[PDB]
Design a binder for these strands. Structure first.
Ligand SMILES: [Mg+2]
Ligand SMILES: [Mg+2]
Ligand SMILES: [Mg+2]
Ligand SMILES: [Mg+2]
Ligand SMILES: [Mg+2]
Ligand SMILES: [Mg+2]
Ligand SMILES: [Mg+2]
Ligand SMILES: [Mg+2]
Ligand SMILES: [Mg+2]
Ligand SMILES: [Mg+2]
Ligand SMILES: [Mg+2]
Ligand SMILES: [Mg+2]
Ligand SMILES: [Mg+2]
Ligand SMILES: [Mg+2]
Ligand SMILES: [Mg+2]
Ligand SMILES: [Mg+2]
Ligand SMILES: [Mg+2]
Ligand SMILES: [Mg+2]
Ligand SMILES: [Mg+2]
Ligand SMILES: [Mg+2]
Ligand SMILES: [Mg+2]
Ligand SMILES: [Mg+2]
Ligand SMILES: [Mg+2]
Ligand SMILES: [Mg+2]
Ligand SMILES: [Mg+2]
Ligand SMILES: [Mg+2]
Ligand SMILES: [Mg+2]
Ligand SMILES: [Mg+2]
Ligand SMILES: [Mg+2]
Ligand SMILES: [Mg+2]
Ligand SMILES: [Mg+2]
Ligand SMILES: [Mg+2]
Ligand SMILES: [Mg+2]
Ligand SMILES: [Mg+2]
Ligand SMILES: [Mg+2]
Ligand SMILES: [Mg+2]
Ligand SMILES: [Mg+2]
Ligand SMILES: [Mg+2]
Ligand SMILES: [Mg+2]
Ligand SMILES: [Mg+2]
Ligand SMILES: [Mg+2]
Ligand SMILES: [Mg+2]
Ligand SMILES: [Mg+2]
Ligand SMILES: [Mg+2]
Ligand SMILES: [Mg+2]
Ligand SMILES: [Mg+2]
Ligand SMILES: [Mg+2]
Ligand SMILES: [Mg+2]
Ligand SMILES: [Mg+2]
Ligand SMILES: [Mg+2]
Ligand SMILES: [Mg+2]
Ligand SMILES: [Mg+2]
Ligand SMILES: [Mg+2]
Ligand SMILES: [Mg+2]
Ligand SMILES: [Mg+2]
Ligand SMILES: [Mg+2]
Ligand SMILES: [Mg+2]
Ligand SMILES: [Mg+2]
Ligand SMILES: [Mg+2]
Ligand SMILES: [Mg+2]
Ligand SMILES: [Mg+2]
Ligand SMILES: [Mg+2]
Ligand SMILES: [Mg+2]
Ligand SMILES: [Mg+2]
Ligand SMILES: [Mg+2]
Ligand SMILES: [Mg+2]
Ligand SMILES: [Mg+2]
Ligand SMILES: [Mg+2]
Ligand SMILES: [Mg+2]
Ligand SMILES: [Mg+2]
Ligand SMILES: [Mg+2]
Ligand SMILES: [Mg+2]
Ligand SMILES: [Mg+2]
Ligand SMILES: [Mg+2]
Ligand SMILES: [Mg+2]
Ligand SMILES: [Mg+2]
Ligand SMILES: [Mg+2]
Ligand SMILES: [Mg+2]
Ligand SMILES: [Mg+2]
Ligand SMILES: [Mg+2]
Ligand SMILES: [Mg+2]
Ligand SMILES: [Mg+2]
Ligand SMILES: [Mg+2]
Lengths: 136, 92, 116, 56, 75
RNA sequence: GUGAAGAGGGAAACAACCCAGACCGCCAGCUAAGGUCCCAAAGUCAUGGUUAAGUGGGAAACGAUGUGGGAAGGCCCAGAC
RNA sequence: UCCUCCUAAAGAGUAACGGAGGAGCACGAAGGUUGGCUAAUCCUGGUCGGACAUCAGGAGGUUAGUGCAAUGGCAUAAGCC
RNA sequence: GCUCAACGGAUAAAAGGUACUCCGGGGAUAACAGGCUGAUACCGCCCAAGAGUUCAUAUCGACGGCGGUGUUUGGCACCU
RNA sequence: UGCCUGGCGGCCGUAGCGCGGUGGUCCCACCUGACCCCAUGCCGAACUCAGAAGUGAAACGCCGUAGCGCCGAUGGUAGUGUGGGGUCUCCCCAUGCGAGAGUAGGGAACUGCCAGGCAA
């Protein structure tokens, strides 16, 4: 499960996931899964979607993960009142704006890429789409 | 590879949106010792034109006010998630 | 490099002295020759300047790089300074340790009449 | 050189600046056809509260 | 909780801005380190407080090698 | 900003939402928000379209020769589907 | 109780049993002023001596240092003699 | 000359019990119930790595996702 | 008047780096010694003094180069003041403002006050 190997601070502010994405161009691989919808992906969802792709495309091909969590989400325990401290860190999320390339794929047919990316797309909460590396 | 395009008169955020929501999109031509030229053109042509790999390499002749200006597509702005162009920079 | 080390050695005196708004007497020493110049409080224009490089002073003395030669400049600056109407000045030693030639220039500048 | 301004909306659920600007134009109530000398200032004041005034 | 402490705020900043006429002694900038520097007719106290040495208008300048912000006064 | 400390019209009813600030009277007219087939004041008003679910008149991932617009891309008189 | 940063929405100010750290001193030189100086960390060579003690040159240039937490600041050096 | 550090310092000098209790008040503040919410709970559904002699979807369903309900555990303290 | 040097500024990277050349007539640099003035917490290395055999090596100045750093439009994009609107965690519209990054390109500075030397 993906997680930052040591951080500056343990507990981060909530913030607001706003604006458009930056990692929009398909940089490394041939194909890729772009996020249409806005949201935030947990460390478990990314790993769950990666396994769905990696198992669909077999040993062959090459996969990237453009997203990484680096935002610790706090969760307050059950049967606990308000206040008396910020809650403990449970899981890590990557905030996803619209137009964010999540995964990229290379060394496979354009058919099998889409069929593999659907299985991953089904794991994720965000609404996604297939994209190809357009040259400039 | 013969794009046809009108000259822009209103330019900014407000005009560009009204334009972009009318099956067109703004672009610009520039290069050499001459001044730059702001250029309004149709979306559905240039969307179909970019599918070919020659578009981002070969020379294009843009028709403006009768005059055909020879240019190459230097830079381009994709719409974040929807498959559509926002803007193109034509180097001379 | 020595030059750049000597420039930063002086800078404090210069930056302190330009703040006060005083007429500074800059002195540049060299193995051969010694220079001197009274500069206006704005810091750009020169009012009086003299050196051993000048033939007016060089023709008299034997060598142009010692105490007795520096003295002769020290007189020549201060003698002119009084003709222009300068009197109250400051002494910018300019990163050169106040001991030999510059001291002989300064003492000769005091003994001539220039007030500092 | 004058211009006839007319207040066409209420000054209730508005900003203190917008309540002030109307006091600077001289508009007291809705439907008050006040006339002011045209300068770059008064046009600034009209442009500030354009939503609730009308020019003649 | 472990934490929950904070110091009282120090009221530091540019008190008199550029163009404001100030009296001989008036504080121009309260700050910690020399973020601005003391130019013409402006002092710099032990607290690095930039104060007016003479009567006149405050003038902010951008000068020197480091490109540093200086504060000057002009009569 | 509004209520508190502000009534009046609208949002069915609804301190704070939208409109607007009640000095008093009149069986006068023009407008705001919001409306105009009947309860209930005022368009079964005019032009060109869309919806066939009573959608309008609660809701997601995801599902499907539902149905309209477009802009393209695969084949013909050697007669493809 | 006092100090530092964020929260604090580009002047100041601004809460919560919000998020992280410190202080209850130290110093007759660690003050004054004058006159000087330049760092980290590597590279290569060199007795014991090795990754690292001390030396030489070269590389980098403030990653250093600042009596003490953090902030802002300092080569004119507030740094070290 | 004061960890008067409860640090604008009530005295120089001060800890507990009450189910034997009592008065003044509060729904400004809890316990029952109602309300608002739905993390949790229960009930669905979406994708399909595997099991099932072979064969994902008879019966199942990992790794993940999205809803409903107000039956649980809670949060808030709006009524009393 | 131009060509070159030296000191003192303004301007602070279009002004700074690396690489390629070049100058010693005077100037500047190293250089030549150390009763002395002074000096090293050892050392004339530094600072200092007394000099004129040498050289332009190093350092410094000047000219040429885009390898970098640096500057940088136009257009678009994000953001946002005000009045609205929505399918309201997020957007959108009218109107005003309008980045950053990136792109074309620009680009090895630019000036003042005295002094000295050479062609006048
Ligand atoms: Mg925040
Ligand atoms: Mg972001
Ligand atoms: Mg309990
Ligand atoms: Mg504009
Ligand atoms: Mg706008
Ligand atoms: Mg020397
Ligand atoms: Mg009021
Ligand atoms: Mg606790
Ligand atoms: Mg408190
Ligand atoms: Mg505070
Ligand atoms: Mg603070
Ligand atoms: Mg603060
Ligand atoms: Mg003082
Ligand atoms: Mg409002
Ligand atoms: Mg009311
Ligand atoms: Mg009402
Ligand atoms: Mg009503
Ligand atoms: Mg309604
Ligand atoms: Mg309504
Ligand atoms: Mg209602
Ligand atoms: Mg209704
Ligand atoms: Mg009613
Ligand atoms: Mg209501
Ligand atoms: Mg009234
Ligand atoms: Mg009417
Ligand atoms: Mg209406
Ligand atoms: Mg009614
Ligand atoms: Mg009726
Ligand atoms: Mg509707
Ligand atoms: Mg579907
Ligand atoms: Mg269909
Ligand atoms: Mg207090
Ligand atoms: Mg702040
Ligand atoms: Mg603010
Ligand atoms: Mg502030
Ligand atoms: Mg408060
Ligand atoms: Mg607090
Ligand atoms: Mg503490
Ligand atoms: Mg100290
Ligand atoms: Mg010193
Ligand atoms: Mg440091
Ligand atoms: Mg520190
Ligand atoms: Mg000091
Ligand atoms: Mg000191
Ligand atoms: Mg006592
Ligand atoms: Mg106490
Ligand atoms: Mg107390
Ligand atoms: Mg007590
Ligand atoms: Mg107290
Ligand atoms: Mg007390
Ligand atoms: Mg007491
Ligand atoms: Mg009892
Ligand atoms: Mg009793
Ligand atoms: Mg009793
Ligand atoms: Mg009782
Ligand atoms: Mg209550
Ligand atoms: Mg209370
Ligand atoms: Mg209970
Ligand atoms: Mg209860
Ligand atoms: Mg509910
Ligand atoms: Mg099943
Ligand atoms: Mg089971
Ligand atoms: Mg299970
Ligand atoms: Mg409350
Ligand atoms: Mg009741
Ligand atoms: Mg270098
Ligand atoms: Mg020597
Ligand atoms: Mg050379
Ligand atoms: Mg140079
Ligand atoms: Mg030349
Ligand atoms: Mg040149
Ligand atoms: Mg720039
Ligand atoms: Mg720019
Ligand atoms: Mg622009
Ligand atoms: Mg608004
Ligand atoms: Mg709004
Ligand atoms: Mg409307
Ligand atoms: Mg609808
Ligand atoms: Mg809203
Ligand atoms: Mg970008
Ligand atoms: Mg050039
Ligand atoms: Mg350059
Ligand atoms: Mg150069």
């Amino acid at each position: 499960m993906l997680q930052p190997k040591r951080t500056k601070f343990r507990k981060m502010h909530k913030g607001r996931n706003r604006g458009l994405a930056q990692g929009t161009d398909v940089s490394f691989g041939s194909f890729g899964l772009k996020a249409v919808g806005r949201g935030r992906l947990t460390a478990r969802q990314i790993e769950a979607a990666r396994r769905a792709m990696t198992r669909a495309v077999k040993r062959q091909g090459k996969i990237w993960i453009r997203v990484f969590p680096d935002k610790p989400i706090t969760e307050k325990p059950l049967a606990v009142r308000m206040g008396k401290g910020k809650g403990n860190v449970e899981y890590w999320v990557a905030l996803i704006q619209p137009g964010k390339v999540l995964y990229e794929m290379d060394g496979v047919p354009e058919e099998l890429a889409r069929e593999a990316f659907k299985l991953a797309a089904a794991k994720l909460p965000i609404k996604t789409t297939f994209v190809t590396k357009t040259v400039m | 590879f013969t794009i046809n395009a009108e000259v822009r008169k209103e330019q900014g955020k407000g005009a560009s949106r009204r334009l972009r929501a009318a099956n067109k999109f703004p672009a610009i031509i520039y290069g050499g010792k001459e001044a730059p030229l702001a250029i309004e053109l149709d979306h559905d042509k240039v969307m179909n034109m970019q599918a070919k790999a020659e578009f981002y390499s070969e020379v294009l002749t843009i028709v403006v006010d009768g005059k055909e200006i020879k240019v190459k597509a230097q830079d381009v702005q994709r719409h974040p998630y929807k498959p559509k162009l926002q803007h193109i920079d034509f180097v001379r | 490099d020595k030059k750049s080390a000597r420039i930063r050695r002086a800078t404090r005196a210069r930056r302190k002295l330009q703040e006060l708004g005083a007429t500074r007497l800059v002195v540049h020493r060299t193995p051969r020759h010694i220079y001197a110049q009274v500069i206006a409080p704005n810091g750009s224009e020169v009012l009086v300047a003299a050196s051993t490089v000048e033939k007016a002073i060089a023709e008299q003395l034997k060598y142009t790089g010692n105490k007795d030669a520096a003295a002769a400049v020290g007189k020549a600056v201060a003698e002119r300074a009084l003709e222009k109407g300068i009197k109250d000045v400051s002494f910018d030693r300019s990163g050169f340790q106040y001991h030999g030639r510059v001291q002989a220039l300064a003492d000769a500048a005091r003994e001539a009449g220039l007030q500092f | 050189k004058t211009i006839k301004i007319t207040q066409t909306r209420s000054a209730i659920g508005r900003l203190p600046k917008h309540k002030a600007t109307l006091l600077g134009l001289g508009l007291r109530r809705i439907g008050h056809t006040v006339e002011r000398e045209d300068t770059p200032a008064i046009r600034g004041m009209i442009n500030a509260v354009s939503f609730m005034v009308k020019v003649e | 909780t472990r934490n929950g402490r904070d110091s009282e705020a120090k009221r530091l900043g540019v008190k008199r801005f550029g163009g404001e006429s100030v009296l001989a002694g008036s504080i121009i900038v309260r700050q910690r380190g020399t973020k601005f520097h003391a130019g013409a007719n402006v002092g710099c106290g032990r607290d690095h407080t930039l104060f007016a040495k003479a009567d006149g208008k405050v003038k902010f300048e951008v000068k020197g090698p480091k490109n540093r912000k200086f504060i000057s006064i002009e009569a």
